[PDB]
Symmetry: D2
Subunit: 327 residues, 4 copies
């Protein structure tokens, strides 16, 4: 019962990448003067080493999964779309009716602080808000937790270039919008874990989940997009509106492709020219086989590669999307 949700990064500041391709870590030396260097969390008023970051077991964020979150990443010392992330995070907490114990500006400053104190130039930055464990010592009960740890990869840097295989899950379906809405990024992964176990048993890396009506939704930690005859399709319902997805669609429109956020069928996936995954934890990933059949030509698709390359170049190009971190 070994389970692989993330392929790389879990305790590795620098992961191996394809030489000469578009994904390259920063070349630097981490000053370890601070015990916060390498991973820093903010928990109940204090910045703490990641190895020491702990939460009350009585927080309903645990016992009821009464919690929502987002993950923004830092690459080459630049935050990517931090404000978009904190905006989505706040909208989700409102929908979940979890009161926010901090302002948008305070959350962004806490996130910048964890990164700065960690010294990490490539980072995974989780912020979550829970319903809390009751009255705080010392009036909102909601708890905000933040951490910046080394960048995490659902699929490894090598597979970002070379591609992955997938199945459409048959043993499990995605959480319905009227049960716990995937539109709200959340920690309830019972169906996503089941789907990953199914993919493993079927000899594939990961799975795409269908919803109650049989339409394609997302996978465990990533959105699913397809390209067919000049148009990029991706699900509207029963998925997170990913910000990597948002970026990929912006890039595709800049390339002159049309984009449709709307219902996607398995039959559409099986006739697609290309399929790729999208998530903050790794970026744009070609899906080159589906249910044991090649997607398109069976190699990373032409548009997927362009979109992926443009995505990584956007981590360095000055724009409204990139914010340098003050170390």
């Amino acid at each position: 019962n070994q389970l692989t949700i993330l392929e790389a990064g879990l305790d590795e500041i620098i992961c191996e990448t394809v030489p000469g391709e578009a994904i390259q870590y920063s070349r630097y030396s981490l000053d370890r003067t601070s015990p916060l260097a390498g991973g820093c969390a903010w928990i109940e008023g204090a910045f703490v080493p990641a190895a020491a970051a702990r939460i009350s077991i009585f927080d309903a964020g645990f016992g009821h999964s009464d919690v929502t979150y987002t993950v923004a990443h830092v690459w080459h010392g630049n935050f990517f779309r931090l404000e978009d992330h904190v905006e989505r995070f706040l909208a989700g907490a409102e929908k979940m009716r979890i009161p926010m114990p901090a302002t948008k500006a305070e959350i962004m400053d806490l996130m910048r602080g964890c990164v700065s104190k960690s010294g990490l130039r490539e980072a995974y930055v989780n912020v979550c808000v829970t319903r809390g464990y009751g009255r705080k010592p010392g009036a909102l009960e909601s708890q905000l937790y933040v951490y910046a740890i080394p960048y995490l990869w659902v699929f490894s840097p090598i597979r970002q270039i070379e591609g992955i295989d997938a199945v459409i899950a048959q043993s499990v379906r995605r959480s319905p919008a009227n049960v716990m809405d995937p539109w709200i990024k959340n920690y309830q992964w019972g169906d996503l874990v089941r789907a990953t176990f199914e993919a493993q048993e079927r000899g594939a890396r990961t799975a795409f989940l269908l919803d109650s009506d049989g339409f394609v939704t997302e996978g465990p930690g990533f959105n699913v997009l397809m390209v067919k005859d000049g148009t990029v399709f991706t699900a509207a319902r029963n998925v997170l509106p990913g910000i990597t997805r948002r970026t990929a669609l912006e890039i595709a429109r800049d390339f002159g492709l049309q984009t449709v956020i709307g219902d996607v069928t398995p039959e559409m996936l099986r006739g697609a020219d290309e399929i790729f995954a999208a998530t903050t934890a790794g970026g744009v990933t070609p899906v080159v086989a589906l249910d044991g059949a090649p997607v398109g030509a069976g190699v990373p698709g032409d548009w997927t590669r362009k979109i992926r390359t443009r995505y990584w170049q956007m981590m360095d190009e000055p724009s409204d999307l990139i914010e340098p971190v003050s170390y």
Copy 2:
């Protein structure tokens, strides 16, 4: 956005009960010799005060809710159906594919240990197992984490409401998690739908809600099973619910009272025509439901059979049996 899931017991060792009725706390002075008294947790090899019980934020039990659990209670210093609870707990972790980092016997001893150290004679005892946060410090052994805690007994509905009854709605804005998403058969921490249903109950002016499944059948509520009585038979859902151990006990009691029992599909129409409706959970026992969607259930007061089952339930806490295990304090 204030949310009431539990009505009593949170940081409250002894709660108010109805004098002369079947629910009575122990009469004693809590021995506070040890800092564990009043609330004891077991976390990563150590017994610690409940107030200091913390888990790694990186446990997948948090970030993926990759966790299952059970809750057994202690009443009058007796564990109730401890072995049934650990057996169900183990079966659910197997189904969830979470490797168990201890034996049944070790789990039972950790639970007994937390209660004994807490000194509580009326206690809520949670054990859960998580996928974990990766390789355990110092240690390819298992990564799963077992956490235990014993805290003062918790009440979904207060002791006074266990006697006087509560009101409910059938939820219309949310459905119960399907068996083929995350099965309610496995007791779990994914309460997104159960919290939404509680908010809907509050908006509609009722205490709590019963959720329907995708096909429109009655399942359970936020932290409790739903049973109904009609013309000499007790009905309760089979699918898309936890097979509750309070439910199991109530059905055993009902049969000994001469009632028939059917675990099977339950419709809203069945509920609306019921003679009686009650809730069942370890966190409070057997609760009359006296109004549904603003209409009285039967005569609108706690029903004859509900009261008999409730009384027998609490009497079982004091009756030596294979269900009762005294805790050594």
Copy 3:
């Protein structure tokens, strides 16, 4: 157990309408010398009086509801969007894998024939194709299709009466039943499987409303018994994409709305969106555009037919007379 799916038009060539408003029947006298006048069907190669139109009980269109269809109407002697209707009909039969035993031009000609022979200037024209009852009489060498095409033209039918087209109706969101899922029997294919739509009508009746809107499995608003559901909010018209028929009245309403400068969005619609809407209206060939002025016992917007509903409805009925590619006069 009495059930009202249609309010007017059954065995009534002329129904009462609101004087001065946009819905008016033709003024004429029907020549009844032909037994086909007043209602004509085409069944298995013969034009017959509608009252005598019967089909084999062994047709799988009955025993398995293995059938799809469309309804086009005639108003003031003009077919409205006949070609759009036959194209959707053909596309649905293909999806349902029912071989079509006639060409598009032949179907259009049979529908024109039924109307012409009925003499009706205001008509409801149903064409359906069934899987059939097996090998046709006289055979046609196993090679041949078993599918059956049935057509009829009868007096125009009203899901909601002409008066209610002006004054509006009330509705409920159904709670006892849900719409057929796309992965069971897709509402995208116009079909005769109305088990859920009948249940929803009964529920509306029990709750004291004229009709019901059904939700899908995920809780989104779909359509009602025989009509699409549209809403208006802050300059945008919304209507469901999934688990509904892509109605041609809906199509026309959205075209009119964009001509009026409104935005249009075919996509997921929630009950919360409906409860906040400025306006709600129904759309179907059997009646046109109907204001919905109360939902679940609460007024919709200001509680009277909305400004945009009325403008769209008025333009819709005007399009029955305005020369265009949407209307084709019937040769009587």
Copy 4:
């Protein structure tokens, strides 16, 4: 787009059976003097030959599938469980809120009359009631519901040879069974959009038929038949989102007579994949072994012991006098 729902019987009074096995047609000669012989229907008060049996196209039983039904069969001149069928029929029409325009006793007499006039000793006897096409010809007091009956030659979902040798099935992945809160499979009905889709999927995947899952992923039934499985001395069959079949009821009665336990309740695909035996049950053919599922053998991959015992006993009950059989008076 050729679709196979039934394998035999559609226009054949006598179909091929396996010599020596439990299924044998009567040996007789049908007098065809009467136009009713070989197939008789009752429509709006008239007994008519099957080939002339037609209904108004305006019946809502067509345009809205506002109709429920049952099928009882006749074998060796005996009706099998006729009264059980009419009681279930009546109960479904009540749930569907279709007023019944005839008594139970009248319904049974019409079915016996169609069979008698048909002359068929092995027959498929459908009775359905529809919402109707409006006021009947000839007061608005009166019911508009239409009762239609026909007796035609016995029909086979799976051929009599396959009844002995077994069939292969798939679990459908492209379609699900109609939910109880859409149109309840508990009411026998004509809405087969999902069942037809499931059949096309089976054909595409190279199996004879499919089993449909419900929304929650549990095993329901197939196109015109219930699904039962045997595991370690217990027969399992779905409770929800299926017709409570009368063949199923008989098979469970027999299983308990044989000492087996029976559970009507939720069935998962994992239960099917672990079963000793799987079989189908329907009035149109009886008890059929399912010997392969999703391309994998069921148990030993040949008709199972209990399946053959139940099927053999089923066919023998067509001849043994009992409360279940009622001879037709021809």
